[PDB]
Design an enzyme around this catalytic site. Structure first.
Site, short mmCIF file in Angstrom:
data_model
loop_
_atom_site.label_atom_id
_atom_site.label_comp_id
_atom_site.label_asym_id
_atom_site.label_seq_id
_atom_site.Cartn_x
_atom_site.Cartn_y
_atom_site.Cartn_z
N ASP A 171 40.51 31.47 32.62
CA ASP A 171 39.22 30.86 32.48
C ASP A 171 38.68 30.98 31.07
O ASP A 171 38.03 30.03 30.60
CB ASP A 171 38.19 31.46 33.44
CG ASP A 171 37.94 32.92 33.21
OD1 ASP A 171 38.83 33.76 33.53
OD2 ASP A 171 36.89 33.31 32.63
N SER A 223 43.01 32.69 38.74
CA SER A 223 42.34 33.89 38.27
C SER A 223 42.96 35.16 38.82
O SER A 223 42.28 35.94 39.50
CB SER A 223 40.84 33.80 38.57
OG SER A 223 40.37 32.56 38.06
N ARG A 280 50.54 40.32 40.31
CA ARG A 280 50.01 41.04 41.47
C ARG A 280 48.78 40.33 42.04
O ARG A 280 47.94 39.89 41.30
CB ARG A 280 49.71 42.51 41.12
CG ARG A 280 49.00 42.68 39.79
CD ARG A 280 48.60 44.15 39.48
NE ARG A 280 47.47 44.17 38.55
CZ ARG A 280 46.19 44.33 38.92
NH1 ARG A 280 45.87 44.52 40.20
NH2 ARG A 280 45.24 44.30 38.00
#
Lengths: 484, 484
Positions: free
Chosen positions: B209, B156, B171
């Protein structure tokens, strides 16, 4: 996101890694807290005997209070009726319009009680309630009404009632402490303040909320045989029949015949104060010895959600003291009584993880106790045992009422925070009833005796009881003992 | 007890006593926050154009990320598969057994990341994860497996992938700050620590997700056309077709041909950053200007639940500043940004009382603001307007995807805290869709396009994507760009 929206599957709950010594302690928790079907059948036999005793002239520990609702609602009632529910923190005022097809509409306001109202004068309380009713009525009936609005008053404080439109306060509870009301009829005290403000309302019934839960739910659902509250407190109400009430012999007028229904507010929190049948453990004994009224409310103490965390706390402390768990831990927080509220067994029973990480976080964050996985498996077992015991014992009350009255099928209209929110409660109670009766039935929706969600007792219920009452009062049909 | 267990009916919401000046401001709030059906259709047309733009060679503000799932689950899939869900605070491990009839079983653990991982070495992170997986597999497969368990990894964090079994970290976010990982493929980093521990797992997929929510829900519910998250953040995923993806021309092997499905992770939070169609008010402009990334995430800002309290706060300050409300109040707590979280519009919309006592207690207790009931009626209307506009804008995303792909009927598999918990959300969204489409249909259960609760995307979905991917890896069918 998270575990998605649908209820996660129950964890597998393998005990394979639990060492022998802890596993022996888990078995000992099973022996302590499991309620067998035979034990349930035994408790129910004694409960029926105490329901009978409470209705006898001698009385018993169960009050079995006549509610003076002497007919069932039909679902075909129509009209506008008020309800007032006086709670500890607020007054709720409800206008109920009954639709005549098991349906209703509500309009309701909530008036939060000033801090001082619970402890000031009698007149101050009844005047405050009248001011709220005037504000309400003036808004909803700007040009008055052609007939006064009948009102039912939910006043769930120990009181005696020789007729439905009366309530002589026996003792205040829930933080109220007002002089000059104990021993007096509250209904004329409220009516006097209503009349002072010239509000077109007639207070025609005073009820306990559980009586309300019964009658509201039977108005919408004609299969309802009981109203039950499973929360911080516990109670049940059902209809008996006049011939079954020895304590009313010689007191009833002839128009309330032997076959007349009579709603009963059991107040069965006090069942088995004699401590002869409920399976109290050493931990239950401590809870009782440390409570405000040791030896009172035995059944409430064994079934109310308020104590389930407290039972776990004492068991855990015992396990610690005996050398089994939390060996290196600072267990100081577990020495505080009631530090574990109902949220602890709830969260522990909801933990979806095999490694019980919800339970781990709860113990570390809230109690400063680090645990091993196998300790958490004990803790989870303990929560399941305590939640399931409380459901199996609550259902002994349902079964005793059904068996007393010969109800082979019933909807049991349930409310309260345990029924509504405790994890798996509905499943636990349905399995308990299935185990008592040994039904051969696959699905809980097909159980002959089953809990369903109640209608609003203290609002809708009190208004419907006011509707039933007003129809008797208009016709001259009695709603209490001769002369009252 | 209380209002009983069933949802109270909606309050009547009389506006009869609201002074003319306050009613003029209410009308002004309806102007600012109402989104008409024609507006929603105008937004949809532009949103389709932006979906097409994000798939084009030149791209656009909507990322439209290919998710490298190039087939639909059939529901007939069987086998054991693992998912790893890595968040900012926790790791979840899920063992999913697929039953082959749109059905599955899960076994799952959760591990809280030690505080020092967020700033540790790359090796500490992957090592920790591998040790959690070793622990888990060692238990649920004490004697090992005949073939390695394929694992799908929900990762995630902003990452790019040229094939499903890869993820190059762009990042770190969520105060992660680990060196040697940004710019690198995290799949081999995890695989190395797995192999060092000799754990029989093969990482085969890395996903977002929301792609998992689309896929898991299509496995269980064959009418699923979209996965949607409506929470603090917002996202959608659906299947497009390779021929519609100009930015992949020239990059794909023949076994991901022009007619192949392709799951897209839209990341459409950034729709309309250029501010061409969303109906931003002065209040939405303030929120963006004071946000961490002004000019970013425009659609998320207009649909996420995180902002709904804040929109209310600024409207209420502006009304106070203009001399309309709270005139004699100390409004200092209202001046704190984000003091009103999603619970404020939520509690206000759920208030069942005509006198809005829940909203009275919320403002008096939490903000030290006393209100008149007519102020509270304006506050309630504002809450309803803000919750309704967020639902109507959210469904413009659903309708854009359905109209893009020609879905006349669809189940839209939804998750996130706004869908799951915001009051009346499902009814707001269903009315929004009926308004867009002008359906002649009476019950929301029967709508041609409807939201339904999703299955678990980040666990179950990642495991089912692992199954579909392994089938292709075993056979040598491609799951990415040529040569990757």
């Amino acid at each position: 996101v998270r575990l998605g929206p649908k209820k996660p599957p129950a964890r597998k709950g393998s005990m394979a890694d639990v060492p022998a010594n802890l596993m022996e302690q888990i078995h000992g928790l099973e022996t302590l807290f499991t309620v067998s079907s035979e034990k349930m059948r035994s408790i129910v036999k004694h409960f029926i005997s105490e329901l009978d005793k409470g209705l006898s002239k001698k009385g018993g520990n169960i009050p079995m209070i006549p509610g003076w609702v002497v007919e069932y609602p039909t679902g075909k009632e129509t009209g506008d009726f008020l309800a007032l529910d006086l709670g500890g923190t607020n007054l709720r005022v409800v206008l109920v319009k009954l639709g005549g097809n098991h349906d209703f509409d509500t309009t309701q306001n909530k008036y939060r009680l000033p801090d001082h109202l619970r402890t000031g004068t009698s007149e101050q309380l009844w005047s405050f309630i009248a001011k709220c009713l005037k504000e309400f009525v003036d808004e909803w009936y700007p040009d008055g009404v052609s007939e006064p609005l009948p009102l039912g008053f939910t006043f769930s404080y120990p009181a005696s009632q020789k007729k439905i439109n009366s309530g002589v306060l026996q003792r205040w509870t829930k933080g109220f402490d007002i002089e000059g009301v104990e021993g007096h009829d509250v209904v004329p005290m409220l009516q006097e303040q209503i009349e002072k403000l010239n509000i077109p309302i007639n207070v025609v019934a005073l009820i306990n909320d559980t009586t309300g839960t019964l009658v509201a739910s039977l108005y919408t659902d004609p299969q309802t045989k009981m109203g039950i509250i499973i929360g911080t407190g516990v109670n049940g109400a059902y209809y008996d029949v006049v011939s079954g009430i020895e304590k009313l012999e010689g007191l009833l007028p002839e128009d309330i015949g032997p076959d007349s229904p009579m709603a009963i507010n059991c107040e069965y929190g006090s069942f088995d104060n004699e401590h002869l049948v409920l399976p109290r453990t050493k931990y239950d004994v401590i809870i009782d010895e440390e409570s405000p009224r040791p030896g009172q409310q035995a059944f409430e103490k064994m079934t109310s959600g308020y104590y389930l965390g407290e039972i776990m706390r004492l068991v855990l402390l015992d396990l610690y003291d005996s050398g089994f768990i939390f060996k290196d831990q600072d267990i100081s927080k577990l020495k505080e009584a009631y530090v574990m509220d109902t949220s602890y067994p709830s969260k522990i029973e909801d933990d979806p993880f095999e490694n019980l990480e919800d339970t781990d976080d709860l113990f570390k964050t809230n109690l400063n106790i680090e645990t091993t996985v196998v300790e958490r498996k004990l803790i989870r077992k303990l929560a399941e045992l305590v939640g399931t015991r409380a459901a199996r014992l609550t259902v002994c009350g349902v079964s005793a009422i059904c068996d007393k009255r010969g109800y082979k099928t019933a909807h049991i209209a349930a409310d309260g925070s345990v029924f509504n929110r405790y994890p798996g409660y509905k499943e636990k109670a349905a399995q308990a009833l299935k185990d008592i009766y040994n039904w051969d039935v696959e699905k809980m929706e097909d159980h002959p005796i089953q809990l369903v969600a109640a209608e609003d007792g203290s609002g809708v219920g009190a208004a419907i009881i006011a509707c039933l009452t007003q129809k008797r009062l208009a016709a001259g049909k009695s709603v209490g003992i001769k002369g009252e």
